[PDB]
Structure 1
Amino acid sequence: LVQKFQVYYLGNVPVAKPVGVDVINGALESVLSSSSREQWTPSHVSVAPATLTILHQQTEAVLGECRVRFLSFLAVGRDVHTFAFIMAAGPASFCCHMFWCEPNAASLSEAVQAACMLRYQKCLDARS
């Protein structure tokens, strides 16, 4: 059920806004300008209904865990390999998680979108 994607985890940075392609592009270029593919942490991203887990490539040790309910934005970068999403870690705290994917990041972004679309809503019939 849960599917895992082989990625380079580029880390997470604080950002100024919860939404925007401008924000995730600037965040990615912060990582790409001072570190190469060799410095990035190879791992897996498991897209579960409630959580995204950044999880090591064979050992299965957790690098980070993000609840889908706090996800505020996601986008593939101007580079088709790069992918990022922003977590609303509170009222003014925003965090941007970044990834590099081979062959590209389209499959991983769609899995995170499906995770954000098929949510359980709380429902109540109040009729007589």
Structure 2
Amino acid sequence: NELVQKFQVYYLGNVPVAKPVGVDVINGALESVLSSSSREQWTPSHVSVAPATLTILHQQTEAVLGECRVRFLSFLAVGRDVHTFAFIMAAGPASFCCHMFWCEPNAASLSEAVQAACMLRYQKCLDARSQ
């Protein structure tokens, strides 16, 4: 199944965004969601990074909060505040959705794991299509 062990983070939720890429887009989404929530409202959760999908699950009860195919993840970033992580999905052909997280001590290891999954997936796809 997974590539690494799940990440214990807070799921801040998801919001629609106008564009598939940009740190300005993800930081606008982060500011909006942080302004309309408090730390107690935050959903403790973990992110499972598998080869083809990212799955977000409720803290240790492990219900499914979201699932995302790497091929439809258009962009990811760490926010200006180093605890925040976001990725943008193409929910459909012209429809974008931004998923956001609070990470302790920071978002370094989640973002690395997600970036690595993207880079690995791209090579596996190029290689599949060249055979």
Taking structure 1 as the reference length, what is the TM-score of the superposition? 0.92
Is this contact kept in 2: 1:76–1:82, CA < 8 A?
yes
Would you say the 8 A contact 2:75–2:89 is kept in 1?
yes
> Does 88-97 or 77-86 show the bigger shift?
88-97
Deviation at 1:125, TM superposition (A): 10
Q: Note if contact 1:13-1:96 (Cα within 8 Å) is conserved in structure 2.
A: yes
- In 2, Cα distance between equivalents of 1:34 and 1:9: 14
Give the Å deviation of 1:3.
2.0
Would you identify which runs of 4 or more consecutive aligned residues in structure 1 move more than 3 Å? 120-128
Change (3 A) 1:85 1:123: closer
* C-alpha distance in 2 between matches for 1:31 and 1:123: 34
Give 5+ residue unaligned stretches, structure 1: none
Pair member with larger Rg: 1
How many residue pairs match? The answer is 128
Q: Relative to structure 1, is the Cα distance of residues 124 and 101 closer, same or farther in structure 2, using a 3 angstrom cutoff?
A: closer
Runs (5+) with no aligned partner, structure 2: none
Quick check: which one's helix share is greater? Answer: 2
The 10-residue stretch of structure 1 (95-104 or 35-44) with the greater mean CA deviation from structure 2 = 35-44
Deviation string, structure 1 residues 27-54 (Cα, Å, up to 9, x no partner): 0001111112111100111111111000
Does the 8 A contact of 2:70 with 2:121 survive in 1?
no
**Structure 1 residues 111 and 122: CA distance shift in structure 2, 3 A:** closer
1:3-27 alpha-carbon deviations (Å, 9 max, x no partner): 2111100000000000000100000
Structure 1 residues 68 and 38 mapped into 2: Cα distance closer, same or farther (>3 Å)?
same
Q: Give the direction of change, closer, same or farther, for the CA distance of 1:103–1:69 in structure 2 (3 Å limit).
A: same
**1:76-100 Cα shifts (integer Å, max 9, x gaps):** 0000000000001222100000000
Residues 3 and 48, structure 1, Cα contact 8 Å, conserved in 2? no
Once residues 72 and 63 of structure 2 are traced to their aligned partners in structure 1, the CA distance between those partners, rounded to angstroms, is 23
Give the superposed CA RMSD. Answer: 2.8
TM-score, structure 2 normalization: 0.90
